Amino acid sequence: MDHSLNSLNNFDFLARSFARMHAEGRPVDILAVTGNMDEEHRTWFCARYAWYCQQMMQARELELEH
């Protein structure tokens, strides 16, 4: 819907859950974080690309992300 109302609100609440779901292996919508695209997000998604790739493919069963 909006990058400052929907994408921004998710970027804050998911920011703390993005790192928490990284060790737990839970589905996290990184795309929401890539919509704005940040300089630190480049190297961040490098390790979060593979992580989300193996945890989401194994998480897809009852819920998609959250």
From Swiss-Prot:
Gene3D superfamilies linked: Glycogen synthesis protein GlgS (1.20.970.20)
State what induces this protein.
Expression is dependent on RpoS.
A Pfam family this protein belongs to? Answer: GlgS
Give a GO biological-process term.
negative regulation of single-species biofilm formation on inanimate substrate
Q: What happens when the gene is disrupted?
A: Deletion mutants show increased flagella and fimbriae production, are hypermotile, and exhibit increased biofilm formation.
| Entry superkingdom | Bacteria
Q: What does this protein do?
A: Major determinant of cell surface composition. Negatively regulates motility, adhesion and synthesis of biofilm exopolysaccharides.
Write out the similarity annotation. Answer: Belongs to the GlgS family.
Protein name, entry field: Surface composition regulator
